[PDB]
Amino acid sequence: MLALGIEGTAHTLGIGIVSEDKVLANVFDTLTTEKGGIHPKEAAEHHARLMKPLLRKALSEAGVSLDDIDVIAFSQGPGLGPALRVVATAARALAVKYRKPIVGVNHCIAHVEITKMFGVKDPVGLYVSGGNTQVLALEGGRYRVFGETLDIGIGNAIDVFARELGLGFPGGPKVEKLAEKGEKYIELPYAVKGMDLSFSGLLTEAIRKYRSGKYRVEDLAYSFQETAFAALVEVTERAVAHTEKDEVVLVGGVAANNRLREMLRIMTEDRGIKFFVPPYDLCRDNGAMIAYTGLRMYKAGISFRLEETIVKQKFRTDEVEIVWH
Numbered sequence: 001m002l003a004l005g006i007e008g009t010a011h012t013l014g015i016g017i018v019s020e021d022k023v024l025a026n027v028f029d030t031l032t033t034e035k036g037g038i039h040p041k042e043a044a045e046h047h048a049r050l051m052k053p054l055l056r057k058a059l060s061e062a063g064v065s066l067d068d069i070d071v072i073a074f075s076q077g078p079g080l081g082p083a084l085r086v087v088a089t090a091a092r093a094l095a096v097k098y099r100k101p102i103v104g105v106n107h108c109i110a111h112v113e114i115t116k117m118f119g120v121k122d123p124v125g126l127y128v129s130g131g132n133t134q135v136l137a138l139e140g141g142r143y144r145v146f147g148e149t150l151d152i153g154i155g156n157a158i159d160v161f162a163r164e165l166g167l168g169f170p171g172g173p174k175v176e177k178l179a180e181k182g183e184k185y186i187e188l189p190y191a192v193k194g195m196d197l198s199f200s201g202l203l204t205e206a207i208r209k210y211r212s213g214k215y216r217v218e219d220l221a222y223s224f225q226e227t228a229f230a231a232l233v234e235v236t237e238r239a240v241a242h243t244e245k246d247e248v249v250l251v252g253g254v255a256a257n258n259r260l261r262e263m264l265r266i267m268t269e270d271r272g273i274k275f276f277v278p279p280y281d282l283c284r285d286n287g288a289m290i291a292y293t294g295l296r297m298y299k300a301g302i303s304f305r306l307e308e309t310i311v312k313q314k315f316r317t318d319e320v321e322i323v324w325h
């Protein structure tokens with residue numbers, strides 16, 4: 001069967017088309033923010049504008065008509081209200097026009113589920129992006145958050161640090177490059193508070209030290225990553241130890257980071273468990289992961305009535321019963 005997926009929780013609009021086994025099309029367009037930061041209304045306008053263009057490009061790349069599609073899937077949340085609302089409207093408008101069933105998909109769950117297309121069974125998922133940072137796994141018929149960020153996502157924290165260092169958006173790859181040339185570890189506040197992550201204290205200290213003049217920017221970047229990532233690794237390990245799962249997945253836009261991968265590979269091999277990172281177009285926000293999870297949901301007999309499709313800005317990961325596992 002085939003599923004169309006529309007992703008637009010934040011700045012990226014993404015449309016994907018998938019089967020149970022294959023990605024047929026996966027196309028993107030991100031809102032260019034030269035000054036960085038989050039722009040809820042600007043994103044909504046980008047999404048309304050780019051909607052038809054991306055749909056056409058997705059259908060051409062897949063090589064099917066909209067009448068080939070068995071189910072329409074959209075990102076229901078969590079995310080930004082105005083952006084989610086333009087995505088939901090588009091998904092509902094396609095569902096009516098072509099008389100297709102519709103399904104609202106949880107954004108974080110979709111980041112982990114997409115890895116099952118590649119033969120991952122039941123992992124602990126480290127989801128790291130701009131807005132989100134969560135460690136999640138299947139426990140008691142649903143996804144449990146074992147540790148999330150108390151404040152900002154690790155991607156956002158790196159972006160704020162980058163912007164302050166004069167490195168424009170996207171700050172992530174730029175900070176990684178700078179970090180590779182670091183030679184000195186500079187003490188910075190630990191980012192683990194209980195089960196959860198706190199990067200705000202780490203960030204403000206890094207900025208304070210940068211403004212002091214006393215340090216190499218490259219050394220500050222290196223230290224910023226080691227502290228941030230060691231914390232991610234530790235909270236990931238704790239989850240693996242409790243769940244007793246044989247595989248870890250690393251997903252989200254920050255999953256491109258080679259130093260973070262390296263450290264997860266070390267942890268997983270020291271424990272004798274698998275490690276897998278999907279292709280990058282399937283790590284960052286994309287419509288294909290929505291399409292795939294939407295497909296699984298539909299095949300398990302899930303189908304949404306109109307009021308079930310209303311967007312959920314604060315959609316919690318554990319609100320969805322994973323009846324398809």
Ligand SMILES: Nc1ncnc2c1ncn2[C@@H]1O[C@H](COP(=O)(O)OP(=O)(O)OP(=O)(O)O)[C@@H](O)[C@H]1O
Nearest residue numbers: 010129130131155171172173253254256257284285
């Ligand atoms: N190599 C990298 N190392 C570290 N961070 C990276 C790297 N590549 C991208 N990022 C970060 O990932 C973020 C972008 O991720 P993504 O494309 O998933 O969009 P997003 O808006 O963060 O999605 P969401 O907020 O819905 O999770 C940016 O903060 C960017 O700096």
Ligand SMILES: [Fe+2]
Nearest residue numbers: 129252284285
């Ligand atoms: Fe995301």
